[PDB]
Amino acid sequence: PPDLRPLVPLDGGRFATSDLNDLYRRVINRNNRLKRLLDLAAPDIIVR
Amino acid sequence: MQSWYLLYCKRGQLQRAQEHLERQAVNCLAPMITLEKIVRGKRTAVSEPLFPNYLFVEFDPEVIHTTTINATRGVSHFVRFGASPAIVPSAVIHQLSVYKPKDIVDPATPYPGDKVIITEGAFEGFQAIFTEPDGEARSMLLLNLINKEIKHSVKNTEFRKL
Amino acid sequence: KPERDGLFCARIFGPVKDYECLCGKYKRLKHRGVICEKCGVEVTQTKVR
DNA sequence: ACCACGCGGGCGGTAGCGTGCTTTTTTCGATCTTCC
DNA sequence: GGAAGATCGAAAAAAGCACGCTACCGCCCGCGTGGT
RNA sequence: UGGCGGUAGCGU
Ligand SMILES: [Zn+2]
Secondary structure, eight states: OGGGSOOOBOSSSOBOOOHHHHHHHHHHHHHHHHHHHHHTTOOHHHHO | OOEEEEEEEOSSOHHHHHHHHHHTTOEEEOOEEEOOOOTTOSSOOOEEESSTTEEEEEEOTTTSOHHHHHTSTTEEEEOBSSSSBOBOOHHHHHHHHHSOOOOOOOOOSSOSSEEEEESSSSSTTOOEEEEEOOSSSOEEEEEOOSSOOEEEEEOTTTEEEO | OOOSSSTTOHHHHOOSBTTBOSSSSOOSGGGTTOBOTTTOOBOOOGGGO
16 A cells, blocks of 8 residues: 555655655566566567 | 577667677667657657667677676666577567568657646646647647637647547 | 556545545535546545545 | 655666675485385 | 495584663765756 | 765764
8 A cells, every 4th residue: 555655755856766656666567567567468578 | 500599778878789789799779769758759750769778689609608798887687588589480480580670650749639737737627639739849739628629829838648 | 646657656546635626626525435527536435546 | 947746666887796703404416325 | 236225524504692771983875867 | 854875973
């Protein structure tokens, strides 16, 4: 849940990002890239 | 004696890595596809690299060492399975060189006949129907509202794809 | 404000304010448990997040 | 010239970065040693 | 009578390293872009 | 008024 990984304001127009949010963003980006390349009929090496 | 390898490059540095590798006399290959459509608009239609952040390199390891290629500017790292770098079979390169590019449009955001949602605009939070992309950054959509459905023109920034 | 289908999306986890829709059409306890149709976020207390 | 964001990921390099503990657990070259 | 189970030490990976409290510093993506 | 890292200190 987002409350367990809060985005605490920094009182300067910036947001402090927890490590969990960054890791989840990495996983989401990698999964989206894999889906996009699978839909592109990529060669076996690239898919692997 | 020459061998084919796959390299994962940096972000937006494919051209720089290709130029540096060509300066070192190493054969380079990267698929091309005439398809480019993002929020920026202003006739984005231009060629873009297929399979981003991937580059095939043909060279002989005994002439140019793998460490030198790994240290080339723009190239991030070798696509390696296990300790040794992976070797791309020549059949894959041959089949990817010629008929790999396809006219099928993967990003469906500019394509019409779809269902989108609007992030901000005159009628926020109302789903819209993409039917005809007149010009660029000009999107006429059948916005649905309680009072009346309106064929309204909004920007690509206003509505979010799906 | 949260995006749609993001890591903080209100539709998935809940509204950002207690008994207040993200859109703002319903901002009272009378509409508790009613999912707003414009933005698809349920009107509930923030603790459900 | 600044202001704002948007996809990615170790870094900068045409290589190499480390460099003063103890105890427990796992695996394996290599014997070994006992014998199927 | 040359192989299979025992093992044996040697190497490699993993986990832990007392608690409270106080003050300061620095930092809270990051660089490569796109319109103006 | 939220944390992380570093430094120094207090009490054992
Ligand atoms: Zn609403």
